[PDB]
């Protein structure tokens, strides 16, 4: 409770900050790239997806088989992520 006191009082801005960063589509990984607009992606549920690249992520930062964040509403890639086992 003492640790939850300062953060509980600092939880007010979490409502105004809850609208962004909500993108979470199970972190589906891509397979390859035949053309630059359209990218083939494969989710862990054995469902292959295809979507165009967003304007917030540069095309040169995309790696073959890289786990990156992707929207579940606009289906676009909002922000990537660097990733740890023993």
């Amino acid at each position: 409770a003492p640790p939850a006191l300062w953060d509980l009082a600092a939880d007010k801005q979490t409502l105004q900050s809850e609208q962004p960063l909500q993108v979470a589509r199970c972190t589906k990984i891509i397979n390859a790239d035949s053309e630059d607009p359209k990218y083939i992606i494969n989710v862990k549920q054995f469902a292959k997806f295809v979507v165009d690249l967003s304007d917030q992520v540069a095309p040169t930062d995309i790696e073959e088989g890289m786990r990156v964040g992707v929207d579940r509403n606009k289906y676009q890639i909002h922000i990537p992520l660097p990733p740890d086992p023993t």
Partner: protein, 339 residues
């Protein structure tokens, strides 16, 4: 010219059509922007008794089967049982189908792949089909694996690796999957170059048909010969094979689409070893003392990989020899070093 005065109204209707197609032709970009998932397509012809019969069987990635007829735009390479097609949220229509997945020989390799694509004019002027299968056979020592793969890299076209253990899988039925897959990348994708090796070891025709895996490799291999002898339009990516021995040669390889240009490469004598080894040493620092006589004579029963290892061993002691250029006796030193 009073009768030809009505053409102006026709041209006004045509330019009015070109002026009015911008909207319904413009909504194609916002309606058919991107298929968000991938669904497999299996062709199945239906009959309605216009009222014509035409349909197809669909299979989504989430293991859900739906119903939809053959629809979309003008189709030329479509209607095949492939994957990676266009699909909307729930309409499940087909809009965009996309495929899912050096010196002594420069004449026969480069010609046999360029003439079936560039010399179509002489093909129509003469009515002659080009040879398809080339067999770089003969005794070992030439280095057909590393030299044929290096020349396939010198073709400047796409190269796809395919070897013996690549097609042979632990399970059954996968051989035809990798044959239709090599025809997916090669036949479906851009024209690529595929070089296989050691075809004689898998072309064994035994008499006792009770235990022989090489006859299942003759089921996949002779299935490829079924997809070459049975499929007349072989103008696309060819099948380049090579063998290291003439012990057991498949007699059913006598066809224009099959291995026809069987070029015999004999034992690598001083001339042939000077050729393939002049290729292997056409760029490195060669001192003006390598007569190639003793070192080209000592290379007996040594393939291009073992001869490349001899070149590496020559590249090993020359650091401590003091000379920055490779000498004559270092080749035979590598020969007597490996064996």
């Amino acid at each position: 010219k009073i009768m030809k005065s009505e053409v102006l109204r026709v041209t006004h209707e045509l330019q009015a059509m070109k002026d009015k197609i911008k909207e319904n032709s413009e909504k194609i970009k916002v309606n058919k922007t991107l298929p968000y998932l991938v669904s497999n397509v299996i062709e199945l012809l239906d009959v309605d008794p216009q009222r014509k019969g035409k349909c197809a069987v669909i299979k989504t990635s989430t293991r859900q089967t739906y119903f939809l007829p053959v629809i979309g735009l003008v189709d030329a390479e479509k209607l095949k049982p492939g994957d990676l097609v266009g699909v909307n949220k729930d309409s499940y229509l087909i809009l965009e189908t996309l495929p899912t997945e050096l010196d002594k020989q420069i004449q026969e390799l480069v010609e046999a792949i360029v003439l079936p694509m560039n010399h179509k004019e002489k093909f129509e002027n003469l009515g002659i089909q080009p040879p398809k299968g080339v067999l770089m056979y003969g005794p070992p020592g030439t280095g057909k694996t590393l030299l044929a793969r290096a020349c396939a890299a010198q073709t400047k076209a796409t190269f796809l690796k395919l070897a013996g253990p690549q097609l042979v899988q632990m399970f059954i039925g996968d051989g035809a999957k990798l044959v239709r897959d090599a025809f997916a990348l090669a036949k479906e994708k851009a024209p690529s170059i595929i070089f296989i090796d050691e075809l004689d070891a898998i072309g064994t025709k035994r008499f006792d048909s009770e235990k022989a895996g090489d006859r299942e490799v003759q089921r996949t291999m002779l299935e490829l010969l079924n997809q070459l002898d049975g499929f007349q339009p072989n103008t696309q990516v060819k099948v380049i094979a090579a063998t290291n021995r003439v012990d057991i040669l498949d007699p059913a390889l006598l066809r224009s689409g099959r291995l026809d240009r069987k070029i015999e490469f004999p034992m690598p004598n001083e001339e042939a070893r000077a050729r393939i080894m002049q290729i292997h040493s056409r760029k490195m620092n060669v001192s003006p003392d390598v007569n190639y006589e003793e070192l080209a004579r000592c290379t007996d029963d040594f393939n291009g990989a073992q001869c490349k290892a001899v070149c590496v061993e020559a590249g090993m002691i020359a650091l401590r020899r003091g000379a920055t250029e490779l000498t004559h006796e270092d080749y035979m030193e590598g020969i007597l070093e490996v064996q």
